[PDB]
Structures are given as structure tokens and as C-alpha cells.
Amino acid sequence: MAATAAEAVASGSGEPREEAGALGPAWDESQLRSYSFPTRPIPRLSQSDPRAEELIENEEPVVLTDTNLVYPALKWDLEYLQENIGNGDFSVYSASTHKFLYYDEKKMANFQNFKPRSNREEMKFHEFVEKLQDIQQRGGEERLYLQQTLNDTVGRKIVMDFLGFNWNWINKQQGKRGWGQLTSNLLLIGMEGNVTPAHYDEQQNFFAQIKGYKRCILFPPDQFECLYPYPVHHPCDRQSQVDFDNPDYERFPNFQNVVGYETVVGPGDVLYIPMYWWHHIESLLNGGITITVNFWYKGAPTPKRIEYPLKAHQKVAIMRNIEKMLGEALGNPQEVGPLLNTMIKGRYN
Amino acid sequence: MAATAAEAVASGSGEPREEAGALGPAWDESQLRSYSFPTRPIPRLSQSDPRAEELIENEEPVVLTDTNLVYPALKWDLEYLQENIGNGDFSVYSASTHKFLYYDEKKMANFQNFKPRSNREEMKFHEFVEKLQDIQQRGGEERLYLQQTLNDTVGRKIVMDFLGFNWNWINKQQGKRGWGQLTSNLLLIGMEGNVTPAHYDEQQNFFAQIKGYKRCILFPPDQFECLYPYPVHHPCDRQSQVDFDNPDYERFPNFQNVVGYETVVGPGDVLYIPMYWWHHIESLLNGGITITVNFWYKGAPTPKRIEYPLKAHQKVAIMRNIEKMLGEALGNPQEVGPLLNTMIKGRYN
Ligand SMILES: O=C(O)CC[C@H](O)C(=O)O
Ligand SMILES: O=C(O)CC[C@H](O)C(=O)O
Ligand SMILES: O=C(O)CC[C@H](O)C(=O)O
Ligand SMILES: O=C(O)CC[C@H](O)C(=O)O
Ligand SMILES: [Fe+3]
Ligand SMILES: [Fe+3]
């Protein structure tokens, strides 16, 4: 029965992997939040597996289990980083809810009726750690999520760890895919339960898990119609307007058709998040703090002769450009919507 | 009472003008079709009136009563033209209904499920006149509408009449408005009751009435949202999808808000139809055949520095361009609609 046959391939992250030396289940289902949509698993392969190379060349997610990409960082933890990360400033987001929706500040100018559910604040690593402890011991509920690009200002031992990354492997990946340069490395440290809502990036991403576990739920670019991203000029550009915890099927009917790809990554796993793929990321409930470092690369330059039909991500690119052009022409982003409706109502719908 | 005050300025063409020498009412109300929308009158002025110049400079319709634009052609009629128009071919449209919706043949390729309610056929003027008589005496109901650009091939006396047009006046109009060159002169001869459905042109137009009477109903460019033009790639591009005789308020709800500008033009009147203004044109019921010659001019070049806010016609221009671009990018016009809906549903509506 196809219905049942399907209810089966809709595993999710699957049965929890077992830790070496019989240290028990890495994590368990009750640590995962519950959503309204189905999900099949992202393949977990070895970098030496020809399949893994296949998925990447073909822009599909895959978790590489043995890259040693950030092997030297697997020793990182709060104590170690405070002693060696530097006296530099670290962007730290604070929020009331478990949801840390990203917002673009340079865009906060066009939409003033927008109020951030989470606020940013610069800190010295020890401050973040301090504030983390107050909350921790005082049993508070304020959630924090440090997210900072690793810059010229980190300490000596961190720079050392950095040099020990597996540049041989990734550089070859950058080379074989024609990608552009590495644009940055984002360091993320969050509290258990922290959620990064579904959104997509215009960067190729190698997501290297370091400490703790993270459940990653991705959606292919062709599910744009089911995820309803905010307007291109809105601060939450690229983020989904749908609240996965309380989805509004009236406003977002096609979210009822969404199908995800998930997996739980841990210390040493590297998840390839292809450019334009939506991803929702959550730190397992009661799993402790999580540490991750990503590698963002500019995508490869678009082929000179366009081949048809277009790939989903090229249509998404086209839609974004229309919204931007219209923004410039009308001289005001607020008017994009009204003109678009006028263009389709009774004509294309 | 504003409601009443308004029910009054909603005259229409107004009281029928009286013919010189007490020859009676030029025409009467029962000769006008009945529609669901209100209309105020287009001003009837003298070319020497500073107001007339005001409306034209400001791109608003006006009927000039004394231009002598086509004074020499006021003698034209079927007999005269057959003897002097030429042996050239004349495009003649035939239709079952009184509505002569224009269709672009070069575009009939993308929409094959489109069937012309009226068909074109080349003829020698005498043929058109012959076919006109058969129908006429045989009491048939097949309607014909000759519409042909006046070309290099017209007879000597017609070329003479042409030279006697008031080029001094119009050339000065072309000059003062910065318009481009005269692109053409369309000759129109239709049967009583013939209707040209609401549509807009991307040409400045001086509409010179010659024989018979025509009721002209125009709408400002900012009523785009009430008139629902077909998709830009459709054969009926620029025409309204709304059937003025049987309007579908379900599909076209805003047609309930449409307000027209009308007038009845006769022998010697010249109606200025500004670029992008919608116009519906009908030959009075039982008024005999009608003859008109238009003057189409390219519009003036768009100012180098764009001033805000945009004028309605600039937004219409913007919408058309979006539809065309999307057509090229997707490599197929049929897909424009689906992408536009995906772009607005749950995001901008
Ligand atoms: O100073 C900051 O926190 C921003 C650093 C910037 O993202 C970079 O290093 O390129
Ligand atoms: O790990 C998170 O919570 C956010 C990850 C971020 O979206 C990325 O693209 O690396
Ligand atoms: O030959 C025809 O009927 C088309 C003539 C063309 O419109 C022109 O004269 O520019
Ligand atoms: O007079 C007609 O029936 C059609 C007139 C045509 O739309 C024009 O722009 O001159
Ligand atoms: Fe991301
Ligand atoms: Fe026209």
C-alpha cells in the first residue's frame, strides 16, 4: 500500500546513532520538537563514498561523517574559548521565545511597523559566558544565541586550531564545484532548545558540527510556494513567514504540502546545505549548549548559455530580482505589493 | 446633495448638437448603446481656445471642432473612394457580433486555444463595397469593418485631398509636444452599430471624424485596475477582457468602479486620444456607415531624470515590461502567470 510505503520512508532523522564505547544513545526522539509535516532522512555518508560526491555535485544535502574538517575544534568548549578566543566583540542575540528569527537591520528602515522578537548586543566572550551563567544558575528563561564571524582578532591557540582544519578537503570541494571564494566562517553557540526558523541563503554552506547536537530540517528550492518567504525588502527577507509551531493554513495553505529532509548532526559531522535550500535548525531539547562553525562560499558563476527548463533556484533568483527592480523603479518598496496585485488580479490568477 | 450633484455631472455626450440650417438633431440618445457605468463629457473646444491647448499639453482628451485637419476629405463617401482610392488591397474584418475585438496575429502562436470572433480578408475597394451591398440588399447581418493604413498606392485625387489636410496645425502640435514622427494614418469605414472594444494604444492619436457619427468612451490610464487588459503575450494584448454588454463582476469586480469620459464626434471633429488612454468606439445605431482617419504619432521621449511619484502611464509601462522580461527569462510566455502567482500568493496579497 503506497500510503503505508510512504509512511515508512518518512522516517525523519531515523533511529538515534550509538556512541562508541557503549556510551549510550547519542540523543533520543523526545529531544526533537514536533511539527505538522513529514520528512525523509538526509543520507549520512563517508567523504570517500562516490555517492557523497554525487549529491554535492548535484546540489543535494548530505552529511559527511569523516571529514576531520574541524578536527582541532572538537576540543572547544566554553572554558577553552574564553581563555583563547580573544578580547574582541561578539554579536549575541537574546530572545523571549525559543525562535530566533533573523532580521536585516539595513532593511529595518522601509518597514517601521516591524519589531524584533530578539535583540542584538555586542559582548566580550567572558560577558556572554557570564550572562550565560547568571541565567543558568538563576533558572531564568531568557535565551541567548551567540553568532559571530571569526575575525582577525582571535587568540593564538584558536588561530592554531584554525590552521589544523582540513583545508585540503574543502579547498578541493571549492575547486571541483567552481564555487567562488570562502566568504566567511560563522561561529554559533546556542542554548538547548534554540531554534533558527526556516530560511534560505545565497551561499554554498558546509555546516560543521562541533559540540552538542542539532536537528537540521531542509526543504528543496522548489518548495518556495509552500514556505512563503517575506517580501524581498522586508527585514526578514529569505525567512519563511510560516510559524512551524502554529502554522496558519488560511494565509499559507500550501504549507500543508511541505515535505522536509532531516538529520541530526553531532561532533564531527559536516552537513552540506546547498545554496537556496531552506533549512530550519534546532538545538536538541535539554541537550546542553551547541557549537557549530560554518563555511560560506559564493556560488559558482551562472553558465553563459541558459539551458531549459530553469532549475527551481533560477526561478527564485528571477522572482527576487523582479522585487528588487520594482523597488527601484517605483522609488519605494512599500508599493511593490500594490503594483504586483494590480498586475495579476483578474489577469493571471 | 453630492450624490445628486454627481448624477448631474454624469451627463454623457450631453444634449445632441443641432445641425446648421435647422437640419435637425445630428443624432439622438436611442442611437447610443447602454452600459453599466457613468460618464462625464469630454470638452468640445476651438483649437484657438487656450483650454484646448491646456488639455493636450496635459495629456487629457478634448474634441477640437474647427481644425480643418481633414477638410478635403469631408467630401469622401463610398462612391468617391472607389473611383479614387486605388487598386491596392484593403484589410477588411468580418464578424458575427457587433464587437470587433482586435487580435495580434504574430502573437496567435503562444495561445492556440484562441479563436478569432472576427476574421481578416484582403480586398480591392470595389470588393469591399460589393460585399457591403450584397449584405445590405440581402438584409444579412454579417458586419464588416474596413481598417487599412493609407499607403503609397492610393489614387491621384486621394493624394490631392491628402495634401490639403491641415498639416500646418498638426505639425505644430507634433512640434510643441515633442512627439516623435507620424507613424501612420488609419482609414476606418464601418457599418452602423459597429463597436471597437475598450483598449489602449502606445501612440498619441488625433482621431479625425469624416462621415457619420461615433460615440467615443475613454478611460484614464489610472483605471487599469478596473479594465483588466489581457496578458501582454496574448493576441488581445491591450484590449480589456471585460464584456461591456455583459460584464462579469465576479472575475472583474473593480469594473464596478469604472468612470468614463464620452463624446459623440461628427464630420470635422478631431478627438485627441492621449497615449495610454483606454477608448471604446461605436458607430451610432442606424446612423449609416462611418468614416474616420487617425493620425498616430510616437510619443515624446521619456524625461532623463525620473520625477516622482510616477504617472499612471509609467506604471502601466512598468507592468508591461515585467511581463515581457519574464517572458524572455522563463523562455515561455505560458509560464508568466504561474511565476507571478507564486511571487504574490501569501506574500503580497
Ligand atoms: O565586527 C563584526 O562583528 C563583523 C565582522 C564582519 O562580519 C567580518 O569579519 O567580515
Ligand atoms: O545553526 C544555526 O542555528 C543557523 C545556521 C545558519 O543558518 C547557517 O546557514 O549556517
Ligand atoms: O500592406 C498593408 O496593408 C500594410 C501596410 C503597412 O501598415 C504600412 O503601410 O506601413
Ligand atoms: O474608430 C475605431 O473603431 C477604432 C479607432 C482606433 O482604436 C484608433 O486608435 O484610431
Ligand atoms: Fe542559514
Ligand atoms: Fe485605438
From Swiss-Prot, chains A, B:
Q: Site feature Important for dimer formation: at which residues?
A: L340
Q: Where is this region: Disordered?
A: 1-51
Q: What is the catalytic activity of this protein?
A: L-asparaginyl-[hypoxia-inducible factor alpha subunit] + 2-oxoglutarate + O2 = (3S)-3-hydroxy-L-asparaginyl-[hypoxia-inducible factor alpha subunit] + succinate + CO2; L-histidyl-[ankyrin-repeat domain protein] + 2-oxoglutarate + O2 = (3S)-3-hydroxy-L-histidyl-[ankyrin-repeat domain protein] + succinate + CO2; L-asparaginyl-[ankyrin-repeat domain protein] + 2-oxoglutarate + O2 = (3S)-3-hydroxy-L-asparaginyl-[ankyrin-repeat domain protein] + succinate + CO2; L-aspartyl-[ankyrin-repeat domain protein] + 2-oxoglutarate + O2 = (3S)-3-hydroxy-L-aspartyl-[ankyrin-repeat domain protein] + succinate + CO2
The EC number(s) this enzyme carries: 1.14.11.30, 1.14.11.n4
Q: Where does Fe cation bind?
A: H199, D201, H279
Which SMART domains does the entry link to? Answer: JmjC (SM00558)
Q: What is the effect of changing D201E?
A: Loss of HIF1A Asn hydroxylation activity. Slightly stimulates 2-oxoglutarate turnover
Name the residues that bind substrate.
D152, Q181, L182, T183, D201, E202, Q203, R238, Q239, A300, N321
Give an example GO molecular function. Answer: [protein]-asparagine 3-dioxygenase activity
Instruction: Specify the enzyme's EC class, one word.
Output: oxidoreductase
Q: Which GO terms describe its cellular component?
A: cytoplasm; cytosol; nucleoplasm; perinuclear region of cytoplasm
Question: What cofactor is needed?
Answer: Fe(2+)
Pinpoint the JmjC domain residues.
142-312
Q: Which InterPro entries is this protein grouped with?
A: Cupin_8 (IPR041667), FIH-1_dom_II (IPR027452), JmjC_dom (IPR003347), RmlC-like_jellyroll (IPR014710)
Q: Which GO terms describe its biological process?
A: negative regulation of Notch signaling pathway; negative regulation of transcription by RNA polymerase II; positive regulation of myoblast differentiation; positive regulation of vasculogenesis; regulation of vascular endothelial growth factor receptor signaling pathway
Binding-site residues for 2-oxoglutarate, renumbered to this chain: Y145, T196, N205, K214, N294
The segments labelled Interaction with VHL in the record are 2-125
Give the protein's biological function.
Hydroxylates HIF-1 alpha at 'Asn-803' in the C-terminal transactivation domain (CAD). Functions as an oxygen sensor and, under normoxic conditions, the hydroxylation prevents interaction of HIF-1 with transcriptional coactivators including Cbp/p300-interacting transactivator. Involved in transcriptional repression through interaction with HIF1A, VHL and histone deacetylases. Hydroxylates specific Asn residues within ankyrin repeat domains (ARD) of NFKB1, NFKBIA, NOTCH1, ASB4, PPP1R12A and several other ARD-containing proteins.
Question: What is the recorded name of this protein?
Answer: Hypoxia-inducible factor 1-alpha inhibitor
Q: Which organism was this protein described from?
A: Homo sapiens
